[PDB]
Design a protein around this ligand. Sequence first.
Ligand code: A1IF3
Ligand code: A1IF3
Lengths: 230, 230, 9, 9
Amino acid sequence: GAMGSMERASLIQKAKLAEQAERYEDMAAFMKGAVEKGEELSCEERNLLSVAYKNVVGGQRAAWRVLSSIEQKSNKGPEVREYREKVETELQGVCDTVLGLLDSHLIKEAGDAESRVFYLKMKGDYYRYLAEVATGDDKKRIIDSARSAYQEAMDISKKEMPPTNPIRLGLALNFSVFHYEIANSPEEAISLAKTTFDEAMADLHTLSEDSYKDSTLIMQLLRDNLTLWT
Amino acid sequence: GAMGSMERASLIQKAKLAEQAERYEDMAAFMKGAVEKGEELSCEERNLLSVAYKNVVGGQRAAWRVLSSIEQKSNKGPEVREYREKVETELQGVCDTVLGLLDSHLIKEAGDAESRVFYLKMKGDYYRYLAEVATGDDKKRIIDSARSAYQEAMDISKKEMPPTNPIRLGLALNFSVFHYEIANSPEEAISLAKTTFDEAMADLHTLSEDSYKDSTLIMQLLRDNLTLWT
Amino acid sequence: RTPSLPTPP
Amino acid sequence: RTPSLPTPP
Ligand SMILES: *Cc1ccc(-n2ccnc2-c2ccc(CC)cc2)cc1Br
Ligand SMILES: *Cc1ccc(-n2ccnc2-c2ccc(CC)cc2)cc1Br
């Protein structure tokens, strides 16, 4: 890879610079390079990886939705479809790249609950993004791949993490969105968000001020979704 | 080029789709392809070209300024400089590409005042962007290249366009920014903005409501700069 | 679509 | 830096 000649520490440094410069494609390329060094990622480094690719795929998804809507309204020549397909293929490529990093070899080397849950949550999210654009023979298998990753993450998080842990909360938030938006399971979505919120509320008393702030931010996003869905 | 196999009309269609999707790199690539078809550009098409590259280089410039500021504060290892240089080279490449389109062969085929002024203004702007990052033997020549393009545009616009024409006004705005920010000539900047504003004000009475709106929008930006500079 | 988790603060 | 011309409306 193109980052093979750069020091791991320099890749991490440049990823942070790229974030400050809002150069998320560069940030992702630097973090891919860092992962490919073969060493486990620290907490901070995992967050850099996540931010980078979330921003890249976020832009692609937003563009895809714009184009897909124009295409739907068209149903003129092949151009709308062609360009939607172009964006779709690029999105799929980014998701496949992230999934590839997780599979080679981030997940298998992740032994601590925090790391393993983080990566399995990512795996669910990127299969979810593939599901958003999927049609044809494999869509069910993509959906099930997302579900399976999220479910393993949920099982570990319930056993190993407090109900206020931000990763646990974020996982629950995203899995509930999977249920609502992908799996046609709004009741499951609502039940997951509600139970997550309530169990977190009950554990807030254990937290410091700074931990309280983070947990309550995510709880408010759960509440916001519950409000939207009910 | 990669767009050689796509119809001109399809490139234009896709540039408009890319704009709606906020995919400005794609938009620029589509418009480069359209220019390379060899035909003159319409008014609308010239604006698409401009929007595309303005957005691309705008992001690069914003990133460059972030990195350059970090670098200045550092004056640690070579990484900040290296990454600033990476962004700088990419910016320079985009400017050279735009300048190349103007030189091959947009300017030489542009006979109407509107088109010729538009392209010469672009030429000034992209040399100005090169000037922003220039050091060493050629910086003076880059600055003079910008100045020369702007000056030819100004001369044509004064002879051939009303003082309220949006292209004439935008040119004056940008040339005044060149004076203030590149040529170390704040008094010239102020005098240009003031005379431009005043001559436009005097001609507003000739305009329809829609033309009035466009001219007065740009006049307000001239006024805003005058306020900042005085 | 429903909002998923945003970027951390 | 001083603002130059923005995108058209
Ligand atoms: C999936 C996930 C979940 C939590 C975090 N995270 C780590 C530290 N703080 C947070 C966090 C993220 C989002 C919010 C809501 C604004 C608060 C706290 C990171 C990830 Br990738
Ligand atoms: C350089 C330039 C100057 C004017 C335009 N333009 C064409 C039609 N309308 C405009 C315009 C641009 C900016 C504003 C201020 C918001 C108003 C009108 C296009 C260019 Br590239």
